[PDB]
Amino acid sequence: DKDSEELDSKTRKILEILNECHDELXXXXXXXXXXXXXXXXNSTELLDYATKLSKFIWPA
Amino acid sequence: RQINKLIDSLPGVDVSAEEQLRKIDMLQKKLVEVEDEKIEAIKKKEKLLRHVDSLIEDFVDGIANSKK
Amino acid sequence: TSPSYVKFFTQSNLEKLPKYKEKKAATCALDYLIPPPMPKQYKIQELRKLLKSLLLNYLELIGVLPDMYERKVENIRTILVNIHHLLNEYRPHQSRESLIMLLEEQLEYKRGEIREIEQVCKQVHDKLTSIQDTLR
Amino acid sequence: NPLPTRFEVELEFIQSLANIQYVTYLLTQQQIWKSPNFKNYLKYLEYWCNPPYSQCIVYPNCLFILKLLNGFMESXXXXXXXXXXXXXXXXXXXXXXXX
Amino acid sequence: LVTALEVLSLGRPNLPTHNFKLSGVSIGLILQRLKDLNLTVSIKIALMNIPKPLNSYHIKNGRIYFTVPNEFEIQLSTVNRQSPLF
Numbered sequence: 409d410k411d412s413e414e415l416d417s418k419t420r421k422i423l424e425i426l427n428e429c430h431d432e433l434x435x436x437x438x439x440x441x442x443x444x445x446x447x448x449x450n451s452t453e454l455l456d457y458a459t460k461l462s463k464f465i466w467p468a
Numbered sequence: 469r470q471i472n473k474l475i476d477s478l479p480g481v482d483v484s485a486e487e488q489l490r491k492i493d494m495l496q497k498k499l500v501e502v503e504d505e506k507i508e509a510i511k512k513k514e515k516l517l518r519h520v521d522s523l524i525e526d527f528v529d530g531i532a533n534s535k536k
Numbered sequence: 537t538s539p540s541y542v543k544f545f546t547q548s549n550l551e552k553l554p555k556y557k558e559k560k561a562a563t564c565a566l567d568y569l570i571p572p573p574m575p576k577q578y579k580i581q582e583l584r585k586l587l588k589s590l591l592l593n594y595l596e597l598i599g600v601l602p603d604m605y606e607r608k609v610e611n612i613r614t615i616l617v618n619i620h621h622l623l624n625e626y627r628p629h630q631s632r633e634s635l636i637m638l639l640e641e642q643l644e645y646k647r648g649e650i651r652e653i654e655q656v657c658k659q660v661h662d663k664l665t666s667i668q669d670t671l672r
Numbered sequence: 673n674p675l676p677t678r679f680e681v682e683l684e685f686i687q688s689l690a691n692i693q694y695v696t697y698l699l700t701q702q703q704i705w706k707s708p709n710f711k712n713y714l715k716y717l718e719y720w721c722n723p724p725y726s727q728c729i730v731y732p733n734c735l736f737i738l739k740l741l742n743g744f745m746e747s748x749x750x751x752x753x754x755x756x757x758x759x760x761x762x763x764x765x766x767x768x769x770x771x
Numbered sequence: 772l773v774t775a776l777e778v779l780s781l782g783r784p785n786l787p788t789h790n791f792k793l794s795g796v797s798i799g800l801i802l803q804r805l806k807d808l809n810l811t812v813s814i815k816i817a818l819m820n821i822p823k824p825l826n827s828y829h830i831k832n833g834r835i836y837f838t839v840p841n842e843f844e845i846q847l848s849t850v851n852r853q854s855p856l857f
Contacts, residue, residue: 419531422524422667423810429656432653441503441506441507448496448499452489453779455628458631458774459631461774466690466733467690467694472584472587475584492639495636499642499643502643502646503646505650506649513657520664524810528813531814534817536820538698539681545713546709550712572677573679574679733783735783739781740793740796743797755792758791
């Protein structure tokens with residue numbers, strides 16, 4: 409009986425580690441990667457337009 | 469001397485810009501590729517987790533058919 | 537107050553706008569509804585020089601004081617302005633460099649996520665194998 | 673300076689939405705809200721958020737504040753009172769980052 | 772450049788994502804979370820000594836629904852669900 413109990417405990421621990429591994433990781437990241445690719449494709453407008461955003465006090 | 473150390477510590481500047489733009493484009497390509505690789509790895513890990521799940525339901529069926 | 541163009545934004549004109557777009561595609565309030573068109577190595581070798589000159593002028597400004605000092609301070613002014621010119625040449629270049637840095641960081645982050653999850657999974661597998669090696 | 677142009681007039685008007693007290697003065701009115709004209713004008717001023725009209729926007733806030741108001745006119749004194757406190761919390765941090 | 776990418780993406784999302792009231796004015800994955808809760812209960816219930824009139828049960832989506840017949844126009848069936856196990 410004692411031996412059987414031990415094996416049951418081991419199985420329980422394995423299951424718990426599994427649930428953790430499932431909570432660690434999926435399609436939302438792929439969608440954000442697609443939208444990110446849509447955002448990267450231009451930098452030339454930002455390298456010449458973002459320079460004028462550093463000099464500007466709020467309008468009065 | 470601090471000014472001399474700073475002008476000598478600035479990153480390597482160039483007289484041309486094609487280098488910088490080229491670097492930017494390359495970095496973009498690397499970004500796309502590494503994103504795809506991430507996707508693949510996530511898929512594989514999902515599969516493995518499915519397998520060890522399967523093992524666990526095997527055990528649960530065992531003890532369930534056992535003690536009661 | 538508000539611009540006068542607001543007086544041309546009635547619901548009827550908004551109902552007449554699509555057909556006016558299709559007709560104009562082939563002067564009035566509906567033109568006020570249409571948006572307006574759009575109007576039409578390097579310096580690091582010289583900076584040192586300029587720097588070296590600045591001190592050389594300062595010494596002069598020290599060695600004069602007499603009413604000669606005025607003339608000297610003029611030259612000093614010119615030197616400082618030159619410095620500003622070179623820095624202007626550093627305004628856009630550094631910006632592009634910053635962009636480069638950002639992108640590189642993104643790459644690294646990408647790989648790191650996967651690496652994390654990977655090592656976790658490995659640990660799990662090893663643990664299970666150990667339990668197996670104790671029964672039979 | 674000579675006579676203005678509708679592009680610069682609408683540009684300065686949409687850029688005036690970055691000021692908080694000016695938007696407060698626009699919302700605390702009683703005549704410009706009786707007829708569906710100012711709302712359709714604000715909803716019309718959404719073309720500045722798209723290129724190449726976005727290349728002339730100096731203040732990034734006025735655009736998003738416009739999208740907020742256009743987001744609020746679809747669905748009286750109280751909410752109008754509600755917005756400025758929050759934006760007031762937001763302002764000074766950006767001001768610190770500017771200079 | 773962050774604000775440049777923000778105005779490229781229409782707006783300035785750091786303002787609503789940082790402001791509270793401004794954010795107040797501005798499905799298959801959840802289903803799998805219920806099935807993971809029965810695998811934890813099923814092994815502890817599987818180990819303990821379940822009484823004889825309770826050997827028959829039906830594991831429902833996120834619970835254990837077990838029956839035993841009586842009367843009063845119904846059947847003596849209950850739904851059980853918990854969390855601890857240690």
